């Protein structure tokens, strides 16, 4: 219907839509209360009018008010003000979508448990539809998904999938070897997932016995191979290998580019070398939107390599860690859910208001990586990251709905969703919260695409503001340098001193800027500019920052003496800074806050 105003879907940076929230909040509560009253309306209230006017009641209600006042005082002292339109330039945190907020409080009054359809039939239908909406967002044709408590656990679930799947060929040899007849042990440890799944579903009556011999039994966990991840992986990946049983020792880091994307040359070397030693590859993780720089792995190149290695009898499962960037795929989808051709992107984005200025905002590389996600076996996606849905809500998508049979337990809508997932009890309110967002904002250019676009355009205005931003702090001149052009909406940057060639000193300078632009120094409620900070250390980044550190004047020797570069990171998730005029209101306020802060660092 034409174009949706995103400004009506947030409470506001200055509570501009606070009466809208409060009025819809109360209307929903009233609808719940009316529902309670008219279940068995012949029942009289067990709580008497006299009991609600008693002193026992007032003393308990007053103790309750004291506790709520203590919570309120603490919340209002220390919580971070990332609701602001253009002063918060840090972590993956902004405002959340009002329809999600409203639906969550609404559903929580029913307190349905989604682990079993009987507890809340409607929140369980909603979660099923959410999973299909995840699969359609990923362009899967017979996929599935469900809400996971968070992205860390959704990653662990993907490794649960890959680990059990890779063990299935061995277990078919022990239970019904007819299916894997004439196949070498190396051939078994390199069967494509579709083939493993087509053979598992073919052997109807023996699936339970095959699964009983799979990695579920505890056996062959070192036989199934190495787990390959970017060297800058999210630390949940170490925890996933640890927990799932393959162990920390079965994790191989793949070096990243000077754009902090997995090096596909390095990936080929490690995979092919491992095949020479006949050590299988359990799987490869492609990161769409990395935690510290917003980089997008060339998932296209990763799957293309996998197609080229199957000719040489090498297969790897691909899991996409799109916890951060997963909802971003909506920017490429038209209202019929077809991926928009790259040549037509700027025209569709102008027609749908995704981007205000008609120029390139997304590279064909990022476009091609997002398109190739449909070829991966499974994806982690966080509704509470770029879905703008309140914590806590992660997600997983699987390419073939039949894969859930490799983890299912019995010992359409599932009667026990806890039978098809890693976790147990789940709030139906979380499902209602995600469903509301997906149904106010369709998962394409007509809805979420417009929200992702505003985030990306806001990130690009800040990038250009930081590029060539210079300050005069006494006799010293401090310059700003962006790390790399953003693959998504995250902009990293550093402060350095002109003429100073000491990298340890620049890391002190950026650590001092961070201290003043965070809760470390001062009251966070009085801070005029807030950001985050991360260390690019040689143990984890290698020399991938070296090209960047050299561009600023530092030598390869200064790089090794410091061992690291401290960078400031801004995951620009505010939806308000895409309009250049609105950004220009906050540009002087940002520079002014940074001036005051630099002048404090040097006195």
Residues from 185 through 224 that contact a copy of itself (CB under 8 A): 212, 215-219, 221-222
One residue of 177, 273, 409, 477 binding a copy of itself per CB under 8 A: 409
Q: Which of 139, 152, 459, 531 binds a copy of itself (CB under 8 A)?
A: 152
522 binds a copy of itself (CB under 8 A): no
In the set 139, 259, 430, 455, which binds a copy of itself (CB under 8 A)? 430
The torsion angles phi and psi of 273, rounded to 5 degrees, stand at -60, -45
| Residues in the chain, total | 603
State which of residues 275, 471, 519, 580 lies at the interface with a copy of itself (CB under 8 A): 519
SS3 of residue 254 by DSSP:
strand
Q: Is 351 helix (H, G, I), strand (E, B) or coil?
A: helix
The contact pattern for a copy of itself, residues 410-429, with x = CB under 8 A and - = no contact, is -x------x---xxxxxxxx
Under the binding rule (CB under 8 A), the answer on residue 394 touching a copy of itself is yes
Residue from 192, 390, 553, 563 binding a copy of itself (CB under 8 A): 390
Q: Is the peptide bond before 470 cis (omega within 30 degrees of 0)?
A: no
2 is a contact residue toward a copy of itself (CB under 8 A) = yes
Piece in contact with a copy of itself (CB under 8 A), picked from 51-59, 273-281, 397-405, 478-486: 51-59
Number of residues that bind a copy of itself (CB under 8 A): 157
In the complex, the smallest distance separating the C-beta of residue 216 from a copy of itself, rounded to whole angstroms, is: 5
Binder to a copy of itself among 370, 435, 493, 516 (CB under 8 A)? 435
Residue 585: phi and psi, rounded to 5, are: -75, -35
Residue 247 vs 474, nearer CB to a copy of itself: 247
Q: Give how far Cα 429 sits from Cα of 105, 112, 147, 414, 571, Å.
A: 7, 7, 11, 18, 27
Give the residue, chosen from 134, 317, 488, 576, that forms a contact with a copy of itself under the rule CB under 8 A.
Answer: 576
The Cβ of residue 469 has, within 10 Å, a number of other Cβ atoms equal to: 18
Q: Is 107 exposed, middle or buried (0-12, 13-18, 19+ CB in 10 A)?
A: buried
- Give the helix/strand (H/E) hosting 320: strand 317-322
Question: Which residue's entry shows tokens 């609701």?
Answer: 83
Displacement of CA 456 from its chain's centroid (Å)? 15
Integer angstrom CA distances of residue 569 from 82, 193, 263, 463, 551: 14, 38, 22, 11, 19
The token pair that represents 428 in the structure block: 């139906």
Stretch that binds a copy of itself, among 66-74, 291-299, 490-498, 547-555 (CB under 8 A): 66-74
Mode of pairing for the β-strands spanning 490-497 and 317-322:
unpaired
For a copy of itself, what does the binding mask look like between residues 238 and 277, x meaning CB under 8 A? Answer: xx-xxxxxxxxxx---------------------------
Of residues 532-551, which lie at the interface with a copy of itself (CB under 8 A)?
532
CB-nearer residue toward a copy of itself: 149 or 513: 149
Q: Is 63 in the site for a copy of itself (CB under 8 A)?
A: yes
- Give the footprint of a copy of itself on residues 485-504 (CB under 8 A): none
Residue closer to a copy of itself (CB basis): 135 or 446: 446
Question: Toward a copy of itself, which CB reaches closer, 369 or 389?
Answer: 389
User: Could you say which of 133, 382, 400, 558 contacts a copy of itself (CB under 8 A)?
Assistant: 382
Q: Which residues of 517-534 are buried (b: 16+ CB within 10 A; e: fewer)?
A: bbeeeeeeeebebbbbbb
Contact 221, 159 (CB under 8 A): no
Among residues 41 and 182, whose Cβ is nearest to a copy of itself? 41
- The residue within the footprint of a copy of itself, chosen from 89, 99, 145, 443 (CB under 8 A), is 99
Q: What counts of helices (H) and strands (E) characterise the chain?
A: 20, 13
Does 290 interact with a copy of itself (rule: CB under 8 A)?
Answer: no
Cα separation values, 464 from 288, 392, 582, Å: 23, 33, 15
**Does 11 interact with a copy of itself (rule: CB under 8 A)?**
yes
């Amino acid at each position: 219907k034409g174009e949706m105003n995103l400004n009506a879907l947030f409470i506001g940076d200055k509570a501009e839509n606070g009466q809208l929230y409060k009025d819809l909040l109360i209307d929903l509560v009233d609808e719940h209360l009316g529902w309670r009253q008219n279940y068995m309306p012949q029942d009289m209230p067990v709580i008497s009018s006299q009991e609600r006017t008693s002193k026992s009641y007032e003393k308990t209600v007053n103790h309750m008010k004291d506790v709520l006042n203590e919570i309120s005082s603490r919340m209002r002292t220390h919580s971070v003000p990332w609701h602001t339109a253009g002063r918060y330039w840090g972590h993956m945190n902004s405002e959340t979508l009002m329809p999600s907020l409203l639906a969550y409080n609404f559903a929580m009054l029913w307190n349905g448990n989604n682990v079993a359809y009987e507890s809340s039939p409607a929140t369980s239908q909603m979660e099923e539809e959410v999973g299909h909406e995840f699969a359609h967002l990923m362009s899967y044709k017979n996929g599935w998904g469900h809400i996971v408590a968070d992205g860390s656990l959704a990653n662990l679930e993907g490794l649960w999938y890959a680990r059990n799947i890779k063990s299935l060929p061995f277990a078919m040899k022990e239970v019904k070897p007819e299916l894997v007849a004439g196949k070498s042990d190396w051939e078994l440890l390199n069967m494509p997932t579709k083939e493993i799944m087509d053979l598992l579903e073919s052997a109807e009556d023996e699936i339970d016995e095959i699964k009983a011999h799979s990695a579920r039994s505890g056996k062959h966990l070192q036989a199934i191979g190495k787990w390959l991840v970017p060297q800058t992986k999210h630390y949940s990946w170490l925890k996933a290998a640890d927990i799932i049983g393959i162990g920390l020792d079965q994790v191989i880091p793949v070096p990243v580019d000077h754009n902090y994307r997995m090096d596909i040359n390095e990936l080929e070397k490690i995979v092919r070398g491992l095949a020479e030693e006949q050590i299988p590859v359990l799987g490869v993780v492609g990161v769409v939107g990395s935690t510290e720089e917003g980089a997008v792995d060339s998932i296209d190149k990763i799957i293309a390599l996998r197609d080229e290695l199957m000719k040489d009898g090498i297969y790897y499962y691909v899991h996409v860690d799109a916890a951060y960037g997963g909802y971003g795929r909506a920017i490429f989808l038209d209202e019929d859910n077809n991926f928009i051709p790259y040549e037509d992107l700027q025209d569709v984005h102008e027609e749908y208001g995704v981007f205000k200025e008609k120029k390139e905002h997304i590279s064909r590389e990022v476009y091609d990586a997002y398109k190739a996600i449909e070829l991966a076996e499974s994806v982690t996606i966080d509704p509470h990251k770029m879905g703008y849905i309140p914590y806590s809500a992660g997600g997983i998508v699987i390419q073939d709905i039949r894969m859930r049979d490799v983890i299912s337990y019995f010992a359409d809508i599932p009667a026990l969703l806890g039978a098809y997932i890693l976790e147990g009890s789940k709030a139906g309110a979380t499902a209602a919260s995600v469903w509301a967002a997906h149904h106010v904002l369709p998962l394409n250019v007509a809805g979420y695409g417009k929200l992702i676009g505003a985030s990306i355009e806001g990130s690009h205005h800040f990038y250009n503001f930081l590029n060539d931003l210079t300050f005069k702090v006494g006799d010293k001149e401090i310059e700003v340098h962006t790390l790399t052009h953003p693959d998504f909406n995250m902009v990293d940057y550093v402060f350095k001193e002109k003429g100073n060639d000491d990298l340890v000193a620049m890391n002190k300078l950026n650590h001092d800027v961070y201290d003043y632009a965070s809760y470390v120094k001062g009251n966070i409620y009085n801070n005029e500019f807030i950001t985050s900070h991360t260390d690019f250390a040689i143990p984890d980044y290698g020399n991938s920052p070296l090209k960047f550190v050299n561009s600023l004047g530092f030598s390869d020797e200064e790089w090794n003496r410091a061992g690291k570069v401290t960078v400031l990171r801004a995951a620009v998730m505010t939806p308000y800074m895409n309009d250049k005029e609105e950004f220009d209101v906050y540009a002087p306020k940002i520079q002014a806050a940074l001036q005051e802060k630099l002048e404090q660092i040097y006195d």
